Amino acid sequence: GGVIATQMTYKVYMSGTVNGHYFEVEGDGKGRPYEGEQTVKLTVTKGGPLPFAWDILSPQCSIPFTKYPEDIPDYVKQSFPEGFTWERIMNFEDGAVCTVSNDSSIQGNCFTYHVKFSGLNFPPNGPVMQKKTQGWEPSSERLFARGGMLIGNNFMALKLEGGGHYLCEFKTTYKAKKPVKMPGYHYVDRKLDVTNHNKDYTSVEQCEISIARKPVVA
Amino acid sequence: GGVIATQMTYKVYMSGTVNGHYFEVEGDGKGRPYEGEQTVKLTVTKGGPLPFAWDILSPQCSIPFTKYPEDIPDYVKQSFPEGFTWERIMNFEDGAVCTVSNDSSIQGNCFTYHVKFSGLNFPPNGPVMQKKTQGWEPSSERLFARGGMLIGNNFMALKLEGGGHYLCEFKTTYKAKKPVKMPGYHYVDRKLDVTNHNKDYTSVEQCEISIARKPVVA
Amino acid sequence: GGVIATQMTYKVYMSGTVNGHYFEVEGDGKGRPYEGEQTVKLTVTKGGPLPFAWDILSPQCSIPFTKYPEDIPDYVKQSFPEGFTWERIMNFEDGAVCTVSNDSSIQGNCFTYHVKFSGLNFPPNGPVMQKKTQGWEPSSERLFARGGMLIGNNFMALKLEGGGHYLCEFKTTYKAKKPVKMPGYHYVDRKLDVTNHNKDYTSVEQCEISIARKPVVA
Amino acid sequence: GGVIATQMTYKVYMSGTVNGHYFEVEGDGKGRPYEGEQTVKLTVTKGGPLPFAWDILSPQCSIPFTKYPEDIPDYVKQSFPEGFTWERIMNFEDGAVCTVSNDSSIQGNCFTYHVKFSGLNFPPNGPVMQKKTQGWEPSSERLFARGGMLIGNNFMALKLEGGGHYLCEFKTTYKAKKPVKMPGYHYVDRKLDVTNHNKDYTSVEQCEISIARKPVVA
């Protein structure tokens, strides 16, 4: 890689509000960027215990750790050392909407992610405010190039306590801070699991596997 | 299969309007339902030549022909001989919206699809009314069970003449006419290509490969 | 008016499907186009009794009968004798979507409206399929000019049996068949009431008052 | 009013990001709450000069100053001294989305508004990032009660330099911190004008007239 080692670490500084409730989070992560393997530990440093499902924040806590085949240009890795930013819109089926923005920078062997999260209109008796969600189903992000940016769309779904799903549509725009070689139409399959946490989720550990690929049936 | 042979044929009767323009279509198709392989020939029997891109109609012309692994229940095949119906909403990025409804019945070795298509708000100088589209990128439909129905979401994209993409979000609801064994969270990867057509697309031939699968990274 | 008399009549021919259920409707209407007063009688000539709330069809049954102040150009009236068409998208809060297209022509003292209605994804246990709706709250359509077309947006709401509202967002695009003088940013306030009907709504009578105006607080 | 004087003042503390760009704003306002008349002066205290149109922030800078007829219960005024909060979603026609949350408190004769603004996906060559907008057309918010909250929908539009409009749909949810008497289906007409500002809009003065009313044609 030259700029990105086979083994990297990263820090996460997140801030934001959910239905008006302010909060702050810090995380320490590590993983093999070229293997698409990752793990991170979060701490609600302010505003905890959170009155909403942690699952809505788990996806906001690292694109550089995506396994890209050699024949598919890696938009995000190419952006360093300059780095990139991403902007995300999350539309939940019960009307809740979230806007999230990240700034990813690099320093030596450590990535630094600054995140601003804004979510609202989560129904008081809904899955999020009642904490009835149980993790995200594995997902598949559809990605393509446009205006020098990489745009990703994903039909996410949170498993519900008692069965059923709580749908959320994701739209993420990755913006490199310098022009890079754009990839073709492809996908990134992911698995995001909370592997550990304390009773009130003021402490959480997450694992994620991200692998890019070309259309299965082409 | 018992009800669905290894080799089947099917007839398509489509009717509808696009920005007020009425039209009728008839098709003769054939394929191997258990192999997910298909081919169909369409004829614009009324209202032709069509003043809009044929690509918006190609996806409306056959779920029974989807290759499902044995460990994933095939919602659509299970529905026969009773059959099923599907309702679809297509949201294009330039504001155009389409609502499509199908009724799939079976008689011996032949499937019969009756289709009603309603599309409007296609900008006069847009890709559809100017016929600047060049086929659909291969897609991946996210499917899950709910209320006894199978619901599918797909981020489709039409290739544009001169480069670039014209996005369309698909939402399809499959309704069996009798209760069947519901599948888990899965996907269906597809490839839909117009393999032949005359000058004004009043005649068209399409090929499609549909394969179901479980999450890649799980 | 010269082309539009002070008292006019009109015929309505509607066809369409709701969750796959086909139907046909015919109506005889009359009103004072310059006073914005209207009344029409509908008959479900085919596919009745309808298994869904009639309220979703009441708004599809006459823009020429809108009272426009003299200082606000009347886009629709100006279009005659050539006439115009309108395309409408209806988004209900429970996910149901409808696409509607009309063609308005004139012959002497009578207007003729041909309508195609396509609605689907109405939840089986929802307000529409269970017939729990009780009319539309009076509405206010926001209108402005663009590309020679008049575009209207309206936040509609159906009153529910037992209290509460069932929201629906309307987007209507009016397309004159000949260039006309475009109006500025304005609104059209309406009142649409079912004044009579038989037991299964296979027969219905509707009254409507439509008045254009400039912003109240400007 | 007892709690709200005929003449009041208020302070505004806003913070947020637009396409990743952080900023802070402070304002001093005054007005006659029962007359629906208002005026406020803003200062970009941090992150200026802003690289985006100020118009997107003008609507985030005071519901208490709305003239409500006596026969229509004033949800917001009733909430004091406890106060209320509002959550807003802004959907622009070019894809940009904003989520805004406010907290309105009262102390004597002064209202205090704390605001968090999150906006993103504003196209770099769009009206907002290029500063081609010229104020909001007067608007009309559709309001109704639900779950003890007041919900408002508004079809907003920004005038564009060179003619034309840039559409934005508003959805605002007002949440009183204590139960109050809920109003019926009604509207609030508004006029929001930037009456003064310096060259780079790091200083701005805004005027607003807000009047509630029942449906015009009922």
UniProtKB/Swiss-Prot annotation, chains A, B, C, D:
Does the entry feature the keyword Flavoprotein, yes or no? no
Could you describe the post-translational modifications of this protein? Answer: Contains a chromophore consisting of modified amino acid residues. The chromophore is formed by autocatalytic backbone condensation between Xaa-N and Gly-(N+2), oxidation of Tyr-(N+1) to didehydrotyrosine, and formation of a double bond to the alpha-amino nitrogen of residue Xaa-N. Maturation of the chromophore requires nothing other than molecular oxygen.
Taxonomically, the superkingdom here is Eukaryota
UniProt keyword terms in alphabetical order: Chromophore, Luminescence, Photoprotein
Record-linked SUPFAM superfamilies: GFP-like (SSF54511)
Q: How is it used?
A: Fluorescent proteins have become a useful and ubiquitous tool for making chimeric proteins, where they function as a fluorescent protein tag. Typically they tolerate N- and C-terminal fusion to a broad variety of proteins. They have been expressed in most known cell types and are used as a noninvasive fluorescent marker in living cells and organisms. They enable a wide range of applications where they have functioned as a cell lineage tracer, reporter of gene expression, or as a measure of protein-protein interactions.
Role summary = Thought to play a role in photoprotection of the coral's resident symbiont microalgae's photosystems from photoinhibition caused by high light levels found near the surface of coral reefs.
Query: What family does the database annotate?
Result: Belongs to the GFP family.
Name of the protein in its database record: GFP-like non-fluorescent chromoprotein
Organism field:
Montipora efflorescens (Pore coral)
List the lineage, top down: Eukaryota, Metazoa, Cnidaria, Anthozoa, Hexacorallia
